[PDB]
Amino acid sequence: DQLRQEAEQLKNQIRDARKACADATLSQITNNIDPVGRIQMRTRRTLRGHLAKIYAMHWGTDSRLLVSASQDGKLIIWDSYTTNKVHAIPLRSSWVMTCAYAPSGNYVACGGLDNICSIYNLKTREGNVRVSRELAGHTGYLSCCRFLDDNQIVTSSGDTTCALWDIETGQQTTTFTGHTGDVMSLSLAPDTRLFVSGACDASAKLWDVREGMCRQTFTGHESDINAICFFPNGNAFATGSDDATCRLFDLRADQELMTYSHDNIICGITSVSFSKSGRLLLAGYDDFNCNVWDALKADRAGVLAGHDNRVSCLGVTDDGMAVATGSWDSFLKIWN
Amino acid sequence: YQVITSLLLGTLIFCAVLGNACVVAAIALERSLQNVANYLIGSLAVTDLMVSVLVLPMAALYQVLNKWTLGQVTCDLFIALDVLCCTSSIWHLCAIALDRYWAITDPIDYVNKRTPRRAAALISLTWLIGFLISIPPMLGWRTPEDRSDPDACTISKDHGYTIYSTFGAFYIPLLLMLVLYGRIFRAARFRIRKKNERNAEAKRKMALARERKTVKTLGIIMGTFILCWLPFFIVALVLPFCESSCHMPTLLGAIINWLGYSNSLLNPVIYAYFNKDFQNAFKKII
Amino acid sequence: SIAQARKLVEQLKMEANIDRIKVSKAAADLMAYCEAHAKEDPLLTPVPASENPFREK
Amino acid sequence: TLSAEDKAAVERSKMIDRNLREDGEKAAREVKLLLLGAGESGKNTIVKQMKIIHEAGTRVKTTGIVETHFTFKDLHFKMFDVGAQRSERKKWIHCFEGVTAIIFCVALSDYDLVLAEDEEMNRMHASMKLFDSICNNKWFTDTSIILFLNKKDLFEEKIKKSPLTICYPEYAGSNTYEEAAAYIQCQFEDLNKRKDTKEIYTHFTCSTDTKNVQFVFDAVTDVIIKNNLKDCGLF
Ligand SMILES: C/C=C\C/C=C\C/C=C/C/C=C/CCCC(=O)O[C@H](COC(=O)CCCCCCCCCCCCC)COP(=O)(O)O[C@H]1[C@H](O)[C@@H](O)[C@H](OP(=O)(O)O)[C@@H](O)[C@H]1O
Ligand SMILES: CC(C)CCC[C@@H](C)[C@H]1CC[C@H]2[C@@H]3CC=C4C[C@@H](OC(=O)CCC(=O)O)CC[C@]4(C)[C@H]3CC[C@]12C
Numbered sequence: 001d002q003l004r005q006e007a008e009q010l011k012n013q014i015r016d017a018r019k020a021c022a023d024a025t026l027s028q029i030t031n032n033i034d035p036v037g038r039i040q041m042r043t044r045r046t047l048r049g050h051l052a053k054i055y056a057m058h059w060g061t062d063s064r065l066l067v068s069a070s071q072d073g074k075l076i077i078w079d080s081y082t083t084n085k086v087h088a089i090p091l092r093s094s095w096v097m098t099c100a101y102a103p104s105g106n107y108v109a110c111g112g113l114d115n116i117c118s119i120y121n122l123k124t125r126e127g128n129v130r131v132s133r134e135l136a137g138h139t140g141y142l143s144c145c146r147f148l149d150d151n152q153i154v155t156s157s158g159d160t161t162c163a164l165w166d167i168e169t170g171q172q173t174t175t176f177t178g179h180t181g182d183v184m185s186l187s188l189a190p191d192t193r194l195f196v197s198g199a200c201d202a203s204a205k206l207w208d209v210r211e212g213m214c215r216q217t218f219t220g221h222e223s224d225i226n227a228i229c230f231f232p233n234g235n236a237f238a239t240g241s242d243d244a245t246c247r248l249f250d251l252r253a254d255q256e257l258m259t260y261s262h263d264n265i266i267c268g269i270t271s272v273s274f275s276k277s278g279r280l281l282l283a284g285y286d287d288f289n290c291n292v293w294d295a296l297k298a299d300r301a302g303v304l305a306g307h308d309n310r311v312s313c314l315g316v317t318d319d320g321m322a323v324a325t326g327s328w329d330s331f332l333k334i335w336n
Numbered sequence: 337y338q339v340i341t342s343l344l345l346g347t348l349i350f351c352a353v354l355g356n357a358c359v360v361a362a363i364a365l366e367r368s369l370q371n372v373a374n375y376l377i378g379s380l381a382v383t384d385l386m387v388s389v390l391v392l393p394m395a396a397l398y399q400v401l402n403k404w405t406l407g408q409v410t411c412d413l414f415i416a417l418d419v420l421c422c423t424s425s426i427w428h429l430c431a432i433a434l435d436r437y438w439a440i441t442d443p444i445d446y447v448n449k450r451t452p453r454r455a456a457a458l459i460s461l462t463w464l465i466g467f468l469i470s471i472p473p474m475l476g477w478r479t480p481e482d483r484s485d486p487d488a489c490t491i492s493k494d495h496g497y498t499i500y501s502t503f504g505a506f507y508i509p510l511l512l513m514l515v516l517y518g519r520i521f522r523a524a525r526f527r528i529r530k531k532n533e534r535n536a537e538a539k540r541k542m543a544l545a546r547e548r549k550t551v552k553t554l555g556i557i558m559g560t561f562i563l564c565w566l567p568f569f570i571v572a573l574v575l576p577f578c579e580s581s582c583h584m585p586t587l588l589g590a591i592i593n594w595l596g597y598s599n600s601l602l603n604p605v606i607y608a609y610f611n612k613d614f615q616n617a618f619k620k621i622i
Numbered sequence: 623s624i625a626q627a628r629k630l631v632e633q634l635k636m637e638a639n640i641d642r643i644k645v646s647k648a649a650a651d652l653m654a655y656c657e658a659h660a661k662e663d664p665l666l667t668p669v670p671a672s673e674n675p676f677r678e679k
Numbered sequence: 680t681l682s683a684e685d686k687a688a689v690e691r692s693k694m695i696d697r698n699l700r701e702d703g704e705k706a707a708r709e710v711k712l713l714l715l716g717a718g719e720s721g722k723n724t725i726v727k728q729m730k731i732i733h734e735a736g737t738r739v740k741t742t743g744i745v746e747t748h749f750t751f752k753d754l755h756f757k758m759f760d761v762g763a764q765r766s767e768r769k770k771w772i773h774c775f776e777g778v779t780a781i782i783f784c785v786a787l788s789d790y791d792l793v794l795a796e797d798e799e800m801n802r803m804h805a806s807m808k809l810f811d812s813i814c815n816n817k818w819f820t821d822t823s824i825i826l827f828l829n830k831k832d833l834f835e836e837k838i839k840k841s842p843l844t845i846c847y848p849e850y851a852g853s854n855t856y857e858e859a860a861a862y863i864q865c866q867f868e869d870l871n872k873r874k875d876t877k878e879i880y881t882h883f884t885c886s887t888d889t890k891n892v893q894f895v896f897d898a899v900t901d902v903i904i905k906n907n908l909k910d911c912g913l914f
């Protein structure tokens with residue numbers, strides 16, 4: 001109909017407001033900040049045992065145990081301190097594309113091409129891990145899942161919709177519609193009241209968990225977004241796309257702040273995450289290596305080279321001690 | 337004089353040990369190079385490394401001095417390690433051929449019943465034939481003529497031992513490997529044989545290229561093995577039976593011995609430095 | 623597909639009705655958070671191996 | 680180090696690693712095939728045809744990906760049907776990198792038909808575009824394709840009643856089953872740009888119980904043998 005006219009008028013008004021709010025680029029503000037210097041990280045632990053291309057990992061809240069998911073249908077609970085395999089959950093479907101480790105440390109979730117978010121109960125009364133609940137309702141591959149708490153989990157799938165699940169009942173308490181393409185990443189707020197999703201329509205949306213409505217939309221990328229991670233403050237996030245460029249968006253400023261790009265990089269980002277202080281943005285790449293980015297100055301600080309294949313997953317402990325990068329060559333690597 | 341030949345033998349020894357060590361290290365430190373065929377190639381490289389660091393050095397010292405200056409016991413051990421490691425290398429070539437033949441003509445066995453235990457069994461079997469060819473001259477089958485000359489080191493020339501060793505070390509492997517690679521050639525040719533005119537011409541050209549490639553590869557393998565070992569085992573069979581009227585020139589005999597010794601240097605070049613997976617691993621190591 | 627147009631225009635107006643702050647203030651807040659927690663960032667400043675759990679017990 | 684808890688943890692890790700090694704050895708003995716096609720291209724008929732005799736060597740139905748595990752002549756096959764995955768293919772097509780072969784099914788009888796999305800798009804043209812896209816992916820450079828042309832009888836009836844020139848304007852020939860079925864096969868063959876690294880095994884699906892799975896087994900064994908010959912340098 002004629003609603004396209006007012007839709008584009010609203011888009012233009014939003015763009016004008018964002019341009020008006022832009023008075024000083026994040027480079028000008030952080031020019032006085034001294035460089036972080038070269039970041040040298042050496043592989044401390046190399047967890048071995050996977051037999052196919054890893055696709056996800058997630059640290060625990062105790063910063064010691066971590067979960068990894070791989071195409072061999074295995075969900076291994078490692079012990080990064082001693083490399084010991086605490087658990088090895090056999091998946092019903094070997095096509096797993098995401099995993100999460102519950103904040104309480106009791107549950108682990110995974111999902112993939114099967115449109116189901118399986119939830120495993122690690123700590124039970126018999127010492128044997130078993131599938132507590134299987135959450136069905138997505139009509140596309142489930143790309144990411146993050147535990148809101150011990151009882152609620154947020155999943156993002158390739159049906160352009162993110163969902164808030166009630167694990168006890170197994171139904172979608174809330175569904176988050178609005179994305180035009182496949183949602184490929186999802187990051188929870190530190191206070192767990194908000195969460196952003198990076199989708200294949202080259203845009204990211206900030207969602208309210210309670211109300212289930214899109215608060216903001218961030219359109220800066222030229223290609224589909226593969227990763228997203230909230231800055232420790234909770235007021236900003238970084239996105240990694242196949243544009244071979246990472247981007248920092250601020251919630252309050254409602255616009256892009258910094259672009260983490262290099263001419264020598266033509267491969268897409270597969271995973272991003274921040275350090276404890278938020279001053280290093282560690283981004284995995286299809287160039288087989290993870291590049292450490294100084295968030296405030298957009299300088300390539302370090303390089304976590306070592307992986308034989310593409311770096312699919314990446315995460316930083318909650319205490320900020322170490323960063324672990326899983327890769328398609330079936331090896332987790334803790335760097336420190 | 338002796339400096340030139342000593343330098344040549346030394347550089348040959350160095351190239352052989354360097355190549356075998358590089359192959360073994362690349363297989364050990366790489367996770368992609370950890371399948372049954374690469375295990376057999378690595379065991380061949382290990383055997384050739386033992387040939388280069390346990391036989392080649394003492395053989396070179398014997399060649400340049402033109403006399404044995406290590407003792408009867410050290411000569412006997414050198415002969416034993418000369419026959420054990422070199423016979424094991426030959427049977428490693430035969431075992432690689434057998435593994436390739438099983439992989440090519442029996443895909444079901446390749447998928448289901450191919451495990452590294454098979455690779456270990458084959459390697460143990462190649463070292464077993466090595467031991468059973470190198471040990472019999474230790475106890476019995478040793479004429480006193482061998483010890484009659486302290487300033488010499490020669491393999492026991494008993495006619496029965498000559499037949500037993502020469503056959504079980506080269507001629508049984510040479511017929512077995514010829515049969516296996518002929519069957520592999522037949523299988524490869526059968527697989528290769530089985531606008532529209534442009535596509536037909538392209539298919540014909542590609543089939544001809546594949547036939548040329550397979551005949552070249554089989555030529556390289558069988559030619560190197562034959563041009564290195566056959567000269568040695570023809571002499572090592574005719575000479576013992578012909579005590580007189582068959583004088584052997586020192587130059588030709590030494591060239592022949594070192595041609596077979598150089599088969600251990602040429603083995604990593606063919607079985608390891610030619611395939612794509614080792615080239616990529618070496619590029620990743622460099 | 624007219625109802626989806628109404629939903630989209632409502633979403634756009636709701637997004638445009640939110641309050642925004644200057645980018646300089648937001649960048650300054652981000653730079654203050656980074657510098658305030660820079661002491662507790664083991665990746666940023668290499669930590670001695672005595673208390674580093676992944677190298678020395 | 681030597682504490683009882685650490686000894687128990689290391690023993691648990693060793694037992695788990697042994698179990699993982701056993702499971703990986705078991706999984707390496709299974710031939711993995713990726714089944715693709717456009718809507719009702721007759722892939723369901725193919726799946727049903729292969730699960731008549733040999734099958735499988737509170738759960739929730741997934742509707743995302745379908746598992747078909749069938750054994751034929753001492754060979755374990757695992758067919759992954761992704762026809763119900765209505766999303767961007769390039770975001771998960773790399774998950775199937777390394778499958779032994781791709782079974783691609785197209786119905787011969789849909790040349791007359793058009794897609795429900797728009798009338799001005801032949802179903803055969805959509806299938807040809809899908810074949811061109813999936814045959815020339817960077818993931819499937821060396822992966823051979825087992826092409827199945829389903830519904831030969833319906834295609835024969837349709838070409839008896841309706842001409843084939845509507846699907847292929849450049850086509851020229853007397854309309855009969857053999858030449859038209861050969862022309863469509865050649866058109867699907869010509870979409871393969873990687874003629875040196877991969878081959879296409881085209882079969883016309885038939886009602887016989889064993890012929891289709893027998894052709895799949897023959898193609899898979901011929902792929903394995905050619906891979907083993909390429910590894911030895913003889914191909
Ligand atoms: C008259 C008509 C026709 C005949 C006339 C002319 C044409 C033919 C002449 C005769 C041929 C002579 C030798 C040719 C070799 C040659 O072409 O080699 C190619 C080029 O590689 C390099 O250059 C790389 C080489 C690296 C070698 C190692 C370097 C270090 C050496 C010392 C090692 C010790 C210290 C490190 C590589 O190999 P290729 O093109 O020959 O083709 C194949 C090869 O034949 C197969 O054997 C091999 O299979 P495998 O052996 O069974 O595992 C295959 O993988 C493949 O490599
Ligand atoms: C001092 C010596 C021991 C060094 C090692 C030499 C080998 C590497 C040579 C000796 C004979 C050569 C072969 C002699 C002839 C041919 C055929 C040639 O052309 C053909 O493929 C035609 C074959 C035919 O017509 O029968 C390809 C190279 C090849 C296999 C040669 C490969 C290299 C070989 C094995």
Ligand SMILES: CC(C)CCC[C@@H](C)[C@H]1CC[C@H]2[C@@H]3CC=C4C[C@@H](OC(=O)CCC(=O)O)CC[C@]4(C)[C@H]3CC[C@]12C
Binds near residue numbers: 344587590594598601
């Ligand atoms: C297959 C590729 C790696 C090439 C392999 C070459 C070898 C077979 C060559 C290189 C150096 C050669 C040697 C160079 C010099 C001598 C000294 C020569 O002197 C003699 O004892 C005879 C003459 C005399 O009595 O003085 C005997 C051959 C020998 C050992 C040669 C044996 C054959 C060798 C080892």
Ligand SMILES: COc1ccc2[nH]cc(CCN(C)C)c2c1
Binds near residue numbers: 422423505594596597
């Ligand atoms: C009868 O003489 C023999 C029998 C078997 C043998 N295997 C290996 C050798 C020696 C190899 N270098 C002299 C080249 C050998 C000799």
